[PDB]
Amino acid sequence: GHMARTTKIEEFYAQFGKYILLVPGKFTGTVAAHDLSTGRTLAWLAGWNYGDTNPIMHHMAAFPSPDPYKGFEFIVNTQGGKNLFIYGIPTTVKEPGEGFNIYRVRYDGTKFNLVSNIAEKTGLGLGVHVTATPDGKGFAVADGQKDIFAEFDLATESVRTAFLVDWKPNNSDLKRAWLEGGTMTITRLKPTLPGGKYDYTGTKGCKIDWELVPGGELFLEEGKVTGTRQTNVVALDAFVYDPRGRWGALSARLPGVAIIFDRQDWEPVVALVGAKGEPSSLPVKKVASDTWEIKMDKVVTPAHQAGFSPDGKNFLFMNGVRQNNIMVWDTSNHADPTKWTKKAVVEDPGWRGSYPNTFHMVFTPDGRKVYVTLWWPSPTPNGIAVVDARNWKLLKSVDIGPDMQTLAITYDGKYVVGVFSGYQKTASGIVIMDTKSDEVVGILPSVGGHHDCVIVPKTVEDLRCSRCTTT
Amino acid sequence: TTKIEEFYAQFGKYILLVPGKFTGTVAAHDLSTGRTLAWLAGWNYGDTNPIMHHMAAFPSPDPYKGFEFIVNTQGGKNLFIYGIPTTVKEPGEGFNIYRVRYDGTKFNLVSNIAEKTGLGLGVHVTATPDGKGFAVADGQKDIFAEFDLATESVRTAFLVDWKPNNSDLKRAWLEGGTMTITRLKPTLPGGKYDYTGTKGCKIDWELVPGGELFLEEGKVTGTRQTNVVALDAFVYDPRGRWGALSARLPGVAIIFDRQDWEPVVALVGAKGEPSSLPVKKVASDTWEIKMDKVVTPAHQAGFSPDGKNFLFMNGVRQNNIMVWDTSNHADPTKWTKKAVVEDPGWRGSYPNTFHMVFTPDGRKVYVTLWWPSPTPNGIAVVDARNWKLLKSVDIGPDMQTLAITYDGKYVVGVFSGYQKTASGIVIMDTKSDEVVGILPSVGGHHDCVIVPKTVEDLRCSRCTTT
Ligand SMILES: [Cl-]
Ligand SMILES: [Cu+2]
Ligand SMILES: [Cu+2]
Ligand SMILES: [Cu+2]
Ligand SMILES: [Cu+2]
Ligand SMILES: [Cu+2]
Ligand SMILES: [Cu+2]
Ligand SMILES: [Cu+2]
């Protein structure tokens, strides 16, 4: 009785509605779109076919389309250089490709089309998170080896702003370069090359020779990451957007700070400090027409993933490794981020060790729940935490598989869709969870080491629960 | 509100293994849980044109604890014939042959047999019936070889060449010619051959479906266009002793004796033509087949699981399945045409019937029905006792290979989007001949295998058919 009778998969896919899931492949070099209504992969593209010799396809965001099945557009970036060598793949390659491309891709109803390489046009090779603006007409990209981020206009493929962030440690000893505090300097960059182009293509600008991998923020203070400016790293990660407009939050993993920027006059306005027991924020001081500073007397713990709720009235930042928790700010005052204050912290007895890290997130459309991945190194099963986003309490945790990464949600709020990625060498898959029962409804196969996933949105309201407001 | 558990619960514990073609990957999926167990990306290892092409897996006592397989690659201008608007000017040479092992957690790239042996061969890979060796054929170079797995060494390699009766390219096959088969010997230090990368190519890419006409029309570039035969596969008699080498352009299957390493007879696909033509030895290492005309090309070739039937699919100028009685295991010169499967809807080049799989009991054979965009592609179901088409089922664009679960319950195939549109894994119930579902697949796969547990399973794997 253990073998099922012949069974069709139709009822399974029918439940989900008409939604397209888009994924990058990390070490596979691919991007793909899957139709959740039929099980078909609609299209894929392999970056090496186009002459990208190190296409570590990393992060992505897609823009609202009136009908994603007839067409949509998205940005996907890559890493490059010695990032090829940090996931245990026993490759003999001596000189890896430079990478750090930013690709604009359009689905036309049949296939993907590689529209442009925005890193080549602009000179900004940036390899970490990609986020769409709330209006769906621009996007940002950050990089945690260079510590630069930029917001870009989609129509003109041009840079609206770019900033460099640098650390100056109180103690030059690498072990204590963050623990004992420092000065963070934020600089508005101006392009140096003809055509208003920046000089940051490929590996140019890297302070460290490879990214700080998931769970590995502290490898740098341990002397396990090489580079020419090791104790000047902050590890920028993402620029996430307030769905109400005007503000974005730039996450810096090593100081555990989220810097709030005003997108109207392009200036940083306040620094939110992640660690439990530390102040809600620290002030930003302007020191020159293009330069601001934040002063920290210590850093208690690194932090990583960040996000606004759909209504913009809560901001989350995930402390990791030295504390593993979800820090929550009351951001209801849209006029003045200097007033945003800590309101809650989600903790759990099971999160007391170095791992699990509270990781990627997605909120339900109504804001009542947030789903948060729980990451561990091999071999402990990684999983999903379900959090009550009104009372700020852990409701349930579920084991899924190795190296759990990002989460998306269908726009009707009914299903969370996430990916796990096998540390680029073992089991991987797409996991789907019903948001009424909080149960896994199934795993689909996935050739991918994805660190991102999105459902293609139809409107700017869908972006409030996409790769716009959170990582 | 619906879980996928009952869906995956219908299948036995079977692993599906797939190459990705233009994705550059290889992957293994557990059909009992939906999880991808492991994948590998060839560009990570410095293969700069990893068109991951054909593969075969060997018997494993417990696939979930470990298994091993061969996967090869194509390279050169094969990168430029799928409509991808790449600006790459100098593609990687390719033609690698990789031995990969799954260890119960990940894939490990064991060796590059093409680099070790000096034979770079880019078309079908087949496992021997004992699971201790494998063959690779190449239809740009017209070379095939059988290899020993344990020692990663060459057991035999042969080159096949065409000398046309009429040197005009449009008439180079139609008006016949002489096919010369030459046993090759290594020419470099340490018993290495000198055929790595694009070395030895007569044409710049593998002929496409229906591509014989494009070659005749001067649309295929290459140094030796009128001397190609387009070798496709070396497929195995599951009873042992014999293999069949398919040559697409003359529509001939050359039968080799695997013990003495000599060709013994040439089966001729075309309906209306003789069962076979003799092979004449003309030197210690050279044999000839003489053809006064070539009536039509052929492609798919292979044995039923009992070894008693051999199939060869004529295409382009006829479109049918030719069937020989191969029950006489002692003497292939006696193998004789016994049936032909035709249909009013099969004429010309399309559908191109270029992959097949039999049920374990040999009662049915499932055949791919491939067409160019945008015609829907599908699967034909053929009764392999009466030799008649039963049904055709539409699947999707660019239908490729077919495998079967070793209990005989489900056909598992792949479709590949012409490397740019919709792709997927499709599963069909062999009792109802209905699709039960499609699962997503980032892949342009032109092969697929279910990992076997026994040598009997190879009778319905990438050994007896392609
Ligand atoms: Cl054998
Ligand atoms: Cu049972
Ligand atoms: Cu991140
Ligand atoms: Cu990542
Ligand atoms: Cu991640
Ligand atoms: Cu073939
Ligand atoms: Cu094929
Ligand atoms: Cu192929």
Among chain A residues, CA nearest to B28: A447
**Reported resolution, Å:** 1.5
CB contact at 8 A, B422 and A42: yes
Partners of A55 on chain B (C-beta within 8 Å) are: 43
Q: Chain B contacts of A412, Cβ < 8 Å?
A: none
Kindly compute the dihedral angle of the four CA atoms of residues A22, A24, A25, A28, in this order, to the nearest 10 degrees.
110
Q: Smallest Cβ distance to B36: which of A93, A427, A439?
A: A427
* Cα–chain center distance at A466: 11
Distance CA A429, CA B142 (A): 40
CA distance A14 to A32: 21
**Burial category of A8 from C-beta neighbours within 10 Å (exposed 0-12, middle 13-18, buried 19 and up):** middle
Q: How many angstroms separate the CA atoms of B128 and B23, rounded?
A: 28
Answer whether B43 sits within 8 Å of A50, measured CB to CB.
no
Nearest to A405 by CA among A355, A357, A351: A357
All structural domains of chain B, each given as residue ranges with its CATH number in brackets, are 5-458 (2.130.10.10)
Rounded-to-integer distance, Cα B407 and Cα B433, Å = 15
User: Of the candidates A42, A441, A446, which has its C-beta nearest B36's C-beta?
Assistant: A446
Cα(B208) to centroid(ligand 7), Å:
9
Q: How far is CA A19 from the centre of its chain?
A: 21
What is the Cα–Cα distance from B27 to B48, expressed in whole angstroms? 19
Q: Which residues contact B198 (CB under 8 A, 6 or more apart)?
A: B75, B76, B93, B94, B95, B120
Asked whether the beta carbons of residue B37 and residue A427 sit closer than 8 angstroms, the reply is yes
Cα B138 → chain centroid: 10
Question: Is the CB of residue A390 less than 8 Å from the CB of residue A309?
Answer: no
Residues of A within 8 A of B10 (CB-CB) are 3-7
The answer to whether the Cα torsion of B106, B110, B115, B120 is positive or negative is negative
Q: What span, in angstroms and rounded, lies between the C-alpha atoms of B352 and B362? A: 22
How many angstroms is it from B248 CA to the middle of ligand 7? Answer: 14
CA B449 to chain centroid, in Å, comes to 12
Q: How far is A357 from chain B (nearest CA, A)?
A: 23
> What would the two tokens of residue A126 be?
């940036």
Interface probe with B: pick from A21, A27, A28, most Cβ of B within 10 Å: A28
Q: Is A265 exposed, middle or buried (0-12, 13-18, 19+ CB in 10 A)?
A: exposed
- Best of A35, A116, A447, A453 to disrupt the B interface by mutation (most B CBs within 10 Å)? A447
Q: Tell me the CA distances in angstroms from B202 to A274, A340, B49, B139, B215, one per residue in order.
A: 65, 71, 20, 9, 12
**Residues before each break in chain A (C–N > 2.5 Å)?**
none
Peptide bond into A377 cis (omega under 30): no
Q: Which amino acid is at B169?
A: L
Question: Measured between CB atoms, which of A2, A8, A28 is closest to B436?
Answer: A8
Interface probe for B, chosen from A2, A3, A5, A7 (most Cβ of B below 10 Å), is A7
- By Cβ distance, the residue of B45, B86, B421 closest to A111 is B421
Say if residue B175 is exposed, middle or buried (CB neighbours under 10 Å; 0-12, 13-18, 19+): middle
- Whole-number Å distance, alpha carbon A289 to ligand 3 midpoint, is 30
Residue A274, burial from CB neighbour count under 10 angstroms (0-12, 13-18, 19+): buried
| Region at B94 (left for phi over 0; alpha for psi -120 to 50; beta for the rest) | left
Strand B377-383 relative to strand A41-46: parallel, antiparallel, unpaired?
A: unpaired
Residue B418: phi and psi, rounded to 5, are: 60, 30
How many other CB atoms sit within 10 Å of the CB of residue B78?
23
Residues of chain A contacting B100 with CB distance shorter than 8 Å: none
Residue pair B60/B452 in contact by the 8 Å Cβ criterion: yes
Cβ A9–B9 below 8 Å, yes or no? Answer: no
Cα–Cα distance for residue pair A238/A304, rounded to 1 Å: 9
Cβ neighbours for B115, distance < 8 A, ≥ 6 positions apart: B96, B196
DSSP state for residue B60 in the 8-state scheme? -
Q: Confirm if A253 and A234 have CB atoms less than 8 A apart.
A: yes
DSSP SS3 for B152: coil
Q: Which residues of A touch B396 (CB under 8 A)?
A: 40
Out of B20, B107, B439, the one facing A445 most closely (by C-beta) is B439
Chain A residues with beta carbon closer than 8 angstroms to that of B27: 445, 447
Determine contact, residues A384/A373, Cβ cutoff 8 Å.
yes
**Checking DSSP bridges between strand B252-257 and strand B262-268, what pairing results, if any?**
antiparallel
DSSP-based three-state secondary structure for A85: helix
**Distance set, CA A270 to CA A166, A294, A315, A382 (Å):** 16, 9, 14, 34
What is the CA(B379)–ligand 8 centre distance, in A? 18
d(CA B211, CA B249): 10
- Beta carbons within 10 angstroms of residue A294's beta carbon: 23
Q: What is the DSSP letter of A109?
A: S
**Phi, psi (rounded to 5 degrees) for A293:** -135, 150
- Cα dihedral A330/A334/A336/A337 (nearest 10): 50
Q: Which ligand is nearest to the CA of B315?
A: 6
CA distance B365 to B354: 13
What distance in Å separates residue B13's CA from the closest CA in chain A? 11
The alpha carbon of residue A433 is apart from the nearest alpha carbon of chain B, in Å, by: 10
Q: Helix/strand/coil (H, E, C) string of B165-229? A: CCCCHHHCCCCCEEEEEEECCCCECCCECCECCCCCCCCCCCCCCCHHHHHHCCCCCCCCHHHCC
| DSSP characters over A344-374 | EEE--GGG-SS-PEEEEEEE-TTSSEEEEEE
The half-sphere exposure of A438 on its side-chain side, counting CA atoms within 13 A, is 17
> What is the number of residues in chain A?
471
Which among B52, B157, B154 has a CA at the least distance from the CA of B100? B52
Check: CB of residue A59 under 8 Å from CB of residue A23.
no
- What residues pair up with A470 in beta bridges, in sequence order? A307
Q: CA torsion sign, B346 to B351 to B355 to B361?
A: negative
The letter for the amino acid at B145 is A
Instruction: Count how many pairs of residues, chain A against chain B, have C-beta atoms within 8 Å.
Output: 196
Residue A95 Cα to ligand 8 midpoint, Å, equals 30
Nearest to B433 by CA among B380, B360, B361, B396: B380
Nearest alpha-carbon partner for B102 in B132, B61, B68: B68
Cβ atoms of residues B62 and B104 within 8 Å? no
Could B4 and A9 be called an inter-chain contact, meaning their C-beta atoms sit closer than 8 Å?
Answer: yes
Question: Quick one: how many helices (H) and strands (E) in chain A?
Answer: 3, 32
Backbone φ and ψ for B202, nearest 5 degrees, come out as -90, -25
**What is the rounded CA–CA span in Å between residue B71 and residue B140?**
18
Sign of CA dihedral B334, B337, B339, B340: positive
Q: Testing the interface with B: which of A40, A103, A115 to mutate, by most B Cβ within 10 A?
A: A40
CA within 13 Å, CB half, B434: 7
Task: State the structure-solving technique.
Answer: X-ray
DSSP 3-state of B300: strand
- The CA distance from B102 to the nearest CA of chain A, in Å, is 10
Task: Quote the CA–CA distance of B57 and B458 in Å, as a whole number.
Answer: 9
Question: Which residues of chain B are within 8 Å of residue A446 when distances are taken between CB atoms?
Answer: 36, 440, 442
CB-CB under 8 Å, B6 with A111: no
**Neighbour tally for A227: CB within 10 Å:** 15
A301-334: burial string, b at 16+ Cβ within 10 Å, e else: bbbbbbbbbbebbbbbbbbbbbbbbbbbbebeee
Tell me if residue A462 falls in helix, strand or coil: helix
Supply A405's token pair.
Answer: 């990464």
Chain A residues lying within 8 Å of B414, measured CB to CB: none
Q: Are A459 and A64 in contact (CB under 8 A)?
A: yes
CB contact under 8 A, A429 and B84: no
CB contact under 8 A, B5 and A42: no
What is the Cα–Cα distance from B158 to B181, expressed in whole angstroms?
A: 7
CB contact set of B284 (below 8 Å; sequence gap of 6+): none
> Is the sign of the CA dihedral B232, B233, B234, B235 positive or negative?
negative
Half-sphere exposure of B199 (CA within 13 A, CB side): 11
Q: Distance of CA A341 to CAs A249, A326, A372, Å? A: 15, 14, 22
Question: Which residue of B lies nearest to A25 if distances are taken between CA atoms?
Answer: B442
Q: What is the length of chain B?
A: 466
Cross-chain Cβ contact A447/B34 below 8 Å: no
DSSP A145-172: TTTEEEEEETTTTEEEEEEEEEEEESS-
State the burial class of residue A391 (Cβ atoms within 10 Å of its Cβ: 0-12, 13-18, 19+).
exposed
Q: Give yes or no for a cis peptide into B351 (omega within 30° of 0).
A: yes
The closest ligand to the CA of A235 turns out to be: 3
Peptide bond into B374 cis (omega under 30): yes
Cα A132–B420–B376 angle (5° rounding)? Answer: 125
Task: Name the one residue in this structure whose structure tokens are 């993402």.
Answer: A238
- Residue A345 exposed, middle or buried by CB count within 10 Å (0-12, 13-18, 19+): middle
Residues ≥6 apart with Cβ < 8 Å to A324: A351, A352, A353, A354, A355, A356, A357, A358
CB-nearest partner of A7 from B36, B48, B436: B436
* Contact assessment for residue B235 and residue B209, using Cβ atoms and an 8 Å cutoff: no
The CA distance from A257 to A277, in Å, is 14
CA distance A111 to A342: 46
Contacts of B85 in chain A (CB under 8 A): 114
Whether A442 sits inside 8 A of B36 (CB atoms) is: no
Q: Are B451 and B15 in contact (CB under 8 A)?
A: yes
Distance in Å, CA A430 to ligand 5 centroid: 14
Contacts of A32 in chain B (CB under 8 A): 440, 442
d(CA B149, CA B133): 5
- Which chain B residues are within 8 Å of A4, Cβ to Cβ? 6-7, 9-10
Closest Cα in chain A, distance from residue B34 (Å) = 5
Taking an 8 Å cut-off on Cβ atoms, the answer to whether B48 and A46 are in contact is no
Q: Which of A8, A28, A39 sits opposite B25 (nearest CB)?
A: A28
Enumerate helices (H) and strands (E) in chain B, giving the number of each: 4, 32
* Integer angstrom CA distances of residue A355 from A352, A379, A380, A383, B50: 8, 12, 10, 12, 37
Instruction: Indicate the residue of A48, A49, A441 with minimum beta-carbon distance to B2.
Output: A441
CA atoms within 13 A on the CB side of A419: 26
Q: Relative to the alpha carbon of A453, which ligand is closest?
A: 5
- Provide the token pair at B203: 């044409």
B147, β-bridge pairs: B134, B154
The answer, yes or no, to whether the previous bond of A90 is cis (omega within 30 of 0) is no
Task: Say how far apart CA B1 and CA B304 lie, in whole Å.
Answer: 44
Task: Report the b/e string of A279-293 with b at 16+ CB within 10 A.
Answer: ebbbebeeeeeeebb
Ligand 2 centroid to Cα of residue B45, in Å, is: 44
Are the CB atoms for B411 and B401 separated by under 8 Å?
no
